[PDB]
Structures are given as C-alpha cells and as structure tokens.
C-alpha cells in the first residue's frame, strides 16, 4: 500500500480548531481551543499548564455543534522571534455578534504567555448570523496579513460591514500611530474611495481552511474549499473542480520532511477523515483528484477518533489533524493527530533540526517603550500625554513652574514651598 | 528668613553625576557626565570645549531611569599638582556576568594640563556585577592618604554567592587601598592598618562591609580629636538610615547612626560636610538631601550624644532662588569648599540640559573679605618621572616601572635576552643591530 | 580689582530687550520690553508669564538692519498705577514713519494683561529717518510725564514738510479733567510749543532720574563722552558735558537707589555698548560732580562679564538695577538676556532690604467699575464718548430729542410710548 497513517500525539483537549508554530526555532506547537484558549505543546510532548493565551471571557463561543462562534484563527508575525507580534480572530458580542481581528504581543517577562494588556483591535466585522464566518489569518511571502471571511449568510439584510465574503489584505508594518494597519499599494482598491481598500478579492461563502502554497515564478497561491449549497474550490494567485458527495473541512500544502512523496501536494479532507490530493497538470493546467488512503502500520492507525475540526502544521512542516466529537467535548477529550508516511522513518536523518528554545524579547522597542505600544517595525507610539522617543517623558500643559517636574501627564511634582497644579502658588 | 538659596552656575550638561576640584590651586571644577565625560569649569565660569576626560566608548552607560551604569566617580590624588594622578570608577562590559565595575588610574597629559593622556590607563580593580542597581562606587582619599572605594551590594542575593561565579568579595564593602607603592607587579598595596591584611579568609582590601545601595558619603576632614569621619546614607530596604564608617564594622549587624522615614519624594541622594567659606553658620554641618531638594542637617545632642535631623529651607533672594530644575543626581565641591548640586530630569536628559547649581547663604556676601583666594593656574607636569620615564608607567611616588623588555633608572635602555654579541646594539627589546660581518638574531654567527 | 561689582544672569530667552521697569504697586513684578512690540512680566520668583503683559507687535514698525532704531521705545507707569492702572508707551509705526506716545490701561478683569482697547494717542511725532529717535518716557518727582526725543532730520528736510517736537524734552500733565485734549501743560513750563520743557538734544541715551533727593534731577548722555543735566527752559545745543572722560559711545544711565549695595547708593552709573561703566556722584561736601570708575569682576558664580552688547537698563521695585544684553548672534538665536548688578561685598538679601510681595489686584477705583461708555482720566473723572452724557456717561443723547415722552435708550435711538411712531416718536397713531 501507498497509504498514510494517523498517530495520536496528545489528547485531553477542548474543541481544538487548529494548530501552528511561530517560526522562532523553538519548535513549539500552539494549539487553538474554540472556547478561547491557546495551549503550547513542546517538542518533547508536554502541554504547558499555563495557556499561552486565555481570552475565554472575551470570546463568545457556541454550545451546539455547528455554532461557529469562538476562537477562529491565529497568525504569528513573520518576525515574531524579534518583535513577539501575533494576531487573533475571535467572535464576541457588543447585531448578533462581532468578529474581531486583534493584535497581541508576547509577555516581555515570559516567552510562553501573552501579555493580555497589549491588545489592539484591528478590524471589527459586524456579523448577523453564526455560520459561514471564515476567519483565517495568514501572512504571505509579501509580508502582508491575509484575512479570509465568509459571508455570514447575509443577502437581503445587506441592503439594510462590507468585509464579509472577501479576502482582506492589510499591511501591519506601519509607523502611523493613528491607524493600526495601512493598505498596501498593490491592493486592487487602494485609494479608489469606492470599494474598501482592504478588500483584495471577494465572492466567498462559507470557506474552509485554505491551502497556502508558498513555492519564484509565482509569489503565493491560496486554494479554498467552499460549499455554498450541497463543493467547489477557488484559487487566488500571487470553479475548479466537479467533485461530488463531500463537505470539505479544508486543506493544506504539505511542505514537511518526513514524507518524501507527499512533498508539494495539496491535501484536502472532510469532516470524517476522507482525504484527497489535488494535482495540477503543468501541461494542461487542469486540476484532478486522487484519493489519499489511510492504513494501520503498528502504532499509527488507519483511523482516528471523532470528527476533524481543523488542521495543524509544526515548524518542521509536518501536518496534523485536530479531532473532537459531541462525546469528546463533554468528556473534555479533543485530540491532536499527526499524519505520518509509514514508508519513511519517523526521524529521517535529513529532517533533524536543533531546538532553539524561545528567548525573551531582545528588541530595543519592547525594552524601553513603556507608556505606549510598539509597532511591528519598532516605532514606539505614545499614549496621550507622553512624548519621549520611548514615551518616557510626560507632557504637562500648562507647564510646571518654579522648578517642578512633569512626572506623569499633567501632574507636577513641586519643590517644597510651591503649591498648585503647576506649582504656581508660593508658600 | 534663615533659608538658603540655589544659584544656577552652568547648564547644557549631559546627565551630570558629580563635581569636584583637583586641589592644585587652579580653582577648576571637574564635572562628571554619566555617559563618560569629565568637563572643566574654570573659575571665571567657562566650560572648556575639549573634555578633560573622554571614555564614553569604554563606558557602558544606561538608558532606563534607575539604570546606574556609567561613569560613577572620580578622585584626584592628594598630590595631583606634582604627579598628575587621578582615579576613575566606571562600568563597562568588555571583559557569566552582566557588566564589570572598574577602578582605573589615569594621568593628566604632560603637554596639556586640561586633558588626561588616555594611554595611561591602569586597571586597579575589576568588580564583577550582576545587576544594574545598588552598584554605586564612590572614590575618595582620607587624610591618611589612602584611597577609599565604597561599593554597594549590586543586589546580589545569597544564592548567587553559593556559585561564586564572579568572586566579587568587594560588593557591599568599603575598600581601602594604598596607591603609593613601588611594586611594579601589583597596582596597589594593602595598608597594614587594614583590619584583614593578614587574614586568608577575609579580603585584605575590605575596610568595612555590610552596605546596601549607599548614597554619596559625606567626608569630614576637620581642616575634633579624631582623624577621619565618613557618613553614608543607606537604604536597608524606605526608612532611610545613616551610617558612620569605622575600621572593620558590619552594617547589617551595626547600629544605624540615625533612622527617619523618608520625605516620600525620594530616598536620600547623599550628603556633604560643609567646610566652605561663604556661609558662616553652615560650617562644620552635615547636610543630606533627597532627589527633590529636601535638605537636612545632622546635629548631635551634647547631653545624650544622639543624632537628630533638622530641616533646611530654601527661599528666593533675587537671582538666588528657593527651587531648581529637575531632580538631584549628585553633589559638588569646589576648591574653596563651596558645595553644589547637579540636577537633571527625564526632560533635561534628551535636551542634554543638566545643570550645576551652587548653594548660597543669602545672609552673607558672595565674596566676603576673608574668602578671597588667588587662582594659581594649572601647570604642566614637571616631575622627574613624567619627563624622563617613557618606556613604562610612573607610580604616584615617582618610581619608573618598566614594560617587559626594558630596564634602567627611567627604562631608557632596551633589554636583549640573550644579549647581543660582537659589539651589537640592543635597540629595541630582543632586537640586535649587528655590525657588518656578524649575522643572526644576536649577531652570534661569524662570516 | 577688590572693589568691582558682578553680573548675575536672571532670565534669558528674550528677543531684543530694550529695557525693564516696575509699576510701583507693591507686586515686585518686573516688566521687560521687547523691541518687536512686547512687554513681558517677570515674577519675583523668576518666572516669565506665558501671556505677554502687552502685545502690540502688529502696530509696531521695527527695524531689520543693525542700527535701525524703529520698534517699541519706552514704557512708564503712572505714579498712581495701583489705583488707576494707567501706563504710557512710546513706539514707532508707519501709517517714513511716525513716533507715537499712547496711554493704555490694565484690564479690569486681569491685572497681568493690558486692555488693548483702552489706547489713547497723546503725541504723534512725524519722523523721517531711522536713527536718533530716542523716545524715553518717565515721570518726575513732580508727577509730570517727561518725553525725551532725538532728531534724525536736516534743515533741508524741515522746509519740505514736520515735527515741532524733535530734539526737545516735553513735559505733559496727564492728570487732567478736560476731555478734549489728552494732556494739559504745567504752569511751570517755559511757555517752542508749550509742551517743551527743554530742547537741543541730539541722539540721547537712557536718562537717569533721581528720586528721594529738595530738587529735580535728570541726567542724559548725548553724543570723548558727553553727559547733560536737564533743567527747565535750557538750550543744550552747543552745551558742554559735565565732565571730560577718555570704546563705544554711551548707551545710557541710571541712579542706583537700591538697597543691596551700600556704597553705590546715590551714584549715577553710565555704560557703553560693551560694558565699560563710569559713575557720577555729587560730592556731599561741595555739591560738585565727580567721576569714579566702576569695574566688573568675577566673584564665584557672580561674573565680571556678560554676553553680547548692552541694549538698555532695568530697575526693579526695590531699586536694584539691571543690564539687558543681546548681540547680532543673540538676536538671530532669539536669546536676549537680563542681568542683575550685584555688590559682592554685601549680602544678597541684607536684613534691611526685605520686602513682602503684595500681589497685584484688579482695579478698584470707582471710575473703572462704573465708567462703561467712555474712558477714565488718571484723576478719576469719566469722559464720555460722542453721544453720551452724565456723571458716569450712563445716559444716552438723542439729537433731535425724543418726543412724546419717549426715552433715549441708545445714542440717537428713541424707545417710544404706545401710540407714537418714528425715529423721534414724532408721528401720532
Ligand atoms: O440575552 C439573553 O437573555 C440570552 O441569553 C442566552 O440564552 C440562551 C442560552 O445561552 C442557550 C444555552 O446556553 S447554556 O447556558 O445552556 O450553555 O440556550 C438558549 O438558546 C439556545 C438554545 O439551544 C435554543 O433555545 S431554547 O429556548 O430552545 O433552549 C436555540 O437553539 C436553536 C439553534 O440556535 C438553531 N440553530 S441555527 O443555526 O439555525 O440558529 C437550531 O438548531 C437546530 C439546527 O438544525 C442544528 O444546529 S446547528 O448548531 O447545527 O446550526 C442542530 O441540528 C441537529 C438536528 O436537529 C438533529 N436532528 S434530530 O431529529 O435528532 O433533532 C441531528 O441531525 C439529524 C438530522 O436528521 C440530519 O442532520 S441535518 O444536518 O440534516 O439537520 C441527519 O439526518 C440523518 C437522519 O436523521 C437519519 N434518519 S433517522 O430517522 O434515523 O434519524 C438518516 O436518514 O441519516 C441521515 C443522515 O443525513 S446526512 O446529513 O448525514 O446526509 O442527522 C441526524 C442525526 O441524528 O444524526 O443533530 C443535529 C446536530 O445537533 S446538535 O447537537 O449539534 O444541535 O440542532 C437543531 C435543533 O433544533 O436542535 O434550533 C435550535 C432550537 O431552536 S428553538 O426553536 O428551540 O429556539 O437557541 C440557542 C441560542 O443560541 O440561543 C437560551 N435562550 S433562551 O431564550 O431560551 O433563554 C444566550 O446567550 S449566550 O451567551 O448563551 O449565547 C442568548 O440567547 C441571549 O443572550
């Protein structure tokens, strides 16, 4: 057989929706739980007791299976190793609910938990329903943040926002302390003032997890599965197939090292673990499906528990399955499964990488900027009432007098003998 | 009424940390900048363009407020007018540890009395440091002629010591070295009066220990039947305490000479003993002050011999004002004995506008008849050592210590080992200039 | 150099300071004059108020070239300013140009700002050139206003006309009740136009004015150096200096009547552009004038020099004197400085020189409180605007008069009784 196999890595999870790495060399795997938690899995296989991110109070999650509200996606800044920037999309309530896209920053004190005080709202998408929400975040090799939103089943209500069913592309590397993101010049509606500049492409309804090929001859490829009504696949570069009888969870482009034959393949799978591969003809540019099969080889088995909720990718490129059921949710037993090529060793010699354990932030901005926030580029944006280079000097208007010092905004520390808000009074 | 006043002398300084004179009669004031500069203020009120000392590349200085790294202290040898010797303590990181607190000896340029010859650096001590607070390192000479070094505890915990990675037996102690030595191996010798000079357990340099985060210490010279008095402010952990320094005491287990809750604007920056001339009433008094210019006087009860704090007030009299800009960073004393405060703020640092302020007694003239002194302008080095000793270094006493490969009274003759042969001349150490007919590194072979 | 004085910097960041003075209201404020047309307040604690005391830089024509004397020239506070808030200002404007002397009044709402609407033009002297302008304002111990004007004109220019006032010392009485003319002529004036008290000056520096003398004394410098004593009805053309001395010509002078310096009391001090000072003192024995040099020397922080060139002098309410300096370099950098003269032989605050600040109060006179449709004379009489009459000008005047019992509410506006129409209620309905 040419089949692959599924190996259980961890269990005891709650409604896992995805997993990914930070690209800092630490080979940590960050697991997303719908209720609003992000947990760390170390390379030795331990789950840290303290969540990396706990926002379950902010997050509105649904009870019933099929309620898509919750924590949707996470993307680490391409330069997270130096600036500790990460991005999160979740649902909350204030007009049913509102889909947020927020930036967070890792604690300068602890590289394994996020400083919750560093939240910055980037986008707030008004939502009217609880399905077709999308919410995937990813960075392209251009360095830009892509946001993939469903349509939220809005149509006649649209006549009465404007971001649903589109792929947004923001530039998070801005110096303007006014706006959290700037629009890249390449966007199709930059400075048009008729369509939103953030919109890069539209027309999505209920997209699954999109496969992201990163490859020279082409910069970036995003393939999405989509099921408006009972499936179709869509390409964004720099209707694609008549397959039937499926509802696809999503897909990935395998760039791992354990499987030689799977390299470069687009893999898609449905709720029940039926996997297919997509192959484009370089000659005819037409897409074709071949099933990918699972079979048991010792410990790694040709099956897994429950239903697929999302996919994972570690820093070495190996891909994962995240599963749960209605039985596994109340029992608090979601699982993380690795996809293995049983034809190949578990650690082929060429696939070894040395763990570089995660270090605290070393950048000049995080170290000295305290009365404001740090942009991903490093500019320290001061809070109101501060103006230093790192916002360390307070502003007092009117100025402190009789030698007073402006210690905090509009607060004068007077010398003995001088009173009043600006030390203007004598005796 | 009975207040003092504060007079601005110069501005445009960069994070000044202290000021002092060289005792050579020139009435120059040397101002210390944290980033690693020493500037000269002439008696006529001029700041020289060229710094007296520029070691800002050597110096590791800190950005954060509360980051104490930088140029810490300076002390002129008691005989600087004759030998041009000065001592400097700064933090650097060029040699495990966080940074290293060095105490170095420099010597004024023999061509220019207003610049120090940077090539004459001699490292005396290198104290490994682990943190960036409680590390203050004040340098001063007592009337014994010895160099006192006052080091904080560098916030080094007891478990840090159990590894003894960087020896740092010196933190939290007062070191006392004898710099007037002739041994060219060691830079300083230990005075026999030291309490541990033979003890193989305690360090011989340690004169007293038990300090944590001491401010600038007041140095009375009695210029009261005792030879030496040194008072330091100290923060045991907030409830500021003041300490008298006497041979071989441990100030975790020694009574603090006074304890008073702070004024809440800041802990005590430090203090001085006023031996100036402009103010009659202030003579002999111990003054201490906090970050915000709250000044105290220490007065002993003749009845109980107990010390007590008494406040001093500031008030405006024309140009002389009862306030000043920013926060106190350090103190100053000129050659006539008048005391100064150096101030800066967060706003004054980026503007590069630290200031030097003179403390004035407005009840007295600015130049009372008796306080007049004649300026003796600084002269270049005339000592026999600086003039003739060229292949080595000069000890503060005058002995010329040769570099490896040199000998002579003033190290003027090179050494060749093995010696040059057949009339050859030893021109540089281990280089023979042979006469024609004789070859080889020592002219040993005959042709 | 045992007897020198010293210079202590008080404030900087000024722009072309030309003088400083106090208001004699007990507040110990020091009012600094900036050439471009500003007057700034320096508090005794050494602060400069953000808002100027007087901002007339739009009205003022000031000069660019070094040696162009146009700008704000002088300021003098009325001797009773604490009660009536009257001040006088001399500046140049061009509507070559015209040297104006105007009266202002401190805002009834704010004692630290001048009500710009209370201007009263007293004199308008036509000028033809930009040098030799003088224009010093001062009140003598007689209570009269003295105005000291230079002359930048030539005889050919006189015939082509305009100013009967240039090169004279005018003496006006500002304490008048006549609402027609802003000033009346004192009977003692030698009555040249009646305003002239003495004439014949050319290019005078700042004149010293002694108080606490039995006599009246005003000394002026004039262009080795020439100094003049001013007396009623005197022609100073071709008149010798009091003494011969001798280096720049003299900027001006003052009489030290301060308290910090014992030895300097009663002396006249003069200085040139570069800080070379001389002193004139009358001998108590023979009443004769005598010259003594005054030197500057460093005493610790107090220094025997200063930056740039002297532009004018200052005097605070306690009588201590000041130097105002700038250079061609300090003007572009916008860094003029105010320097205090100190006697280092004496304490900075001698026991006997202490005075308590009486902070400035809003106007309390009956006139400023009740006179609303006119202006207040320094005496207290309320002078009505056209179309108003009465003790406090509170009753409007209607011409022709209102008829049929109508009430004259606003000037030439009748409030008619029911049954009567028209601008004077002349028509019956
Ligand atoms: O403000 C205030 O005040 C408020 O507050 C609050 O409140 C709330 C709360 O909260 C909640 C809770 O909470 S807690 O606390 O408790 O936690 O509650 C509430 O609410 C909620 C609830 O729930 C309710 O209400 S009440 O009142 O009632 O209670 C509601 O709910 C709802 C929902 O919402 C809806 N949805 S939507 O979307 O529309 O909106 C619905 O649901 C439905 C649907 O359908 C679904 O869902 S989802 O999610 O998905 O969307 C589900 O479904 C299901 C079904 O039904 C079933 N069936 S049965 O019959 O069994 O029943 C199943 O399935 C099935 C079927 O049939 C199929 O399927 S399908 O898809 O098609 O449908 C299939 O078929 C099959 C067959 O069957 C066979 N045959 S036989 O015969 O044998 O059977 C064969 O043929 O085979 C086939 C196959 O086929 S295929 O497909 O495969 O080809 O299958 C079957 C089976 O069985 O298997 O199942 C499903 C699933 O399930 S689950 O579990 O997931 O669910 O569901 C449904 C139902 O209905 O159930 O509806 C619901 C109900 O409604 S009513 O009417 O009732 O109203 O609402 C909710 C909400 O959310 O709200 C409360 N309220 S109150 O007022 O009451 O108080 C809140 O807040 S928070 O914070 O919480 O948020 C709010 O409200 C406010 O704020």
Residue numbers in the entry:
A (entry chain B): 214 to 307, 315 to 380, 386 to 440, 444 to 458, 463 to 470, 482 to 670
B (entry chain A): 214 to 308, 314 to 441, 444 to 457, 461 to 670
C (entry chain C): 213 to 307, 316 to 381, 385 to 414, 420 to 441, 446 to 455, 462 to 484, 488 to 670
Can I see the authors' text?
To structurally characterise HHIP-C:GAG interactions, we determined the 2.7 Å resolution crystal structure of HHIP-C in complex with a 30-mer heparin molecule. HHIP-C comprises an N-terminal 6-bladed β-propeller and 2 C-terminal EGF repeats, previously identified in the complex of HHIP-C with HhN ligands. The heparin chain contacts two separate clusters of HHIP surface residues (GAG ‘site1’ and GAG ‘site 2’) at either end of the molecule. In this arrangement, a HHIP-C anti-parallel dimer coordinates one single heparin chain by using a central positively-charged region formed by residues from both HHIP protomers. The heparin backbone displays a right-handed helical structure with roughly 4 sugars per turn, in agreement with previous structural studies. A total of 8 monosaccharides are resolved in the structure, running from a reducing (O1; sugar I) to a non-reducing end (O4; sugar VIII) and forming hydrogen bonds with several polar side chains. We also determined the crystal structure of a HHIP-C:SOS complex, which exhibits the equivalent anti-parallel, dimeric HHIP arrangement bound to two SOS molecules coordinated at the same site compared to heparin. In summary, our HHIP-C crystal structures in complex with GAG molecules identify two discrete GAG-binding sites on the surface of HHIP-C, which are distinct and non-overlapping with the HhN-binding interface, thus suggesting that both GAG- and HhN-binding can occur simultaneously. Our HHIP-C:heparin complex structure also suggests that GAGs can mediate the formation of long oligomeric chains of HHIP. We observe two HHIP oligomerisation interfaces - an anti-parallel ‘head-to-tail’ heparin-bound HHIP-C dimer with a total buried surface area of 603 Å2, and a ‘head-to-head’ dimer with a buried surface area of 981 Å2 in the crystal. The ‘head-to-tail’ dimer interface is smaller than physiological dimer interfaces and is likely stabilised by the heparin molecule (PISA ΔiG P-value = 0.41, shape complementarity score = 0.75), while the larger ‘head-to-head’ interface is more likely to be physiological (PISA: ΔiG P-value = 0.43, shape complementarity score: 0.52).
Hedgehog-Interacting Protein (HHIP), the only reported secreted inhibitor of Sonic Hedgehog (SHH) signalling, binds directly to SHH with high nanomolar affinity, sequestering SHH. HHIP is composed of an N-terminal domain (HHIP-N) that shows weak sequence homology to the cysteine-rich domain (CRD) superfamily, typically involved in small molecule-binding. The C-terminal domain of HHIP is composed of a β-propeller and two EGF repeats (HHIP-C). Our data suggest a multimodal mechanism, in which HHIP can bind two specific sites on the SHH morphogen, alongside multiple GAG interactions, to inhibit SHH signalling.
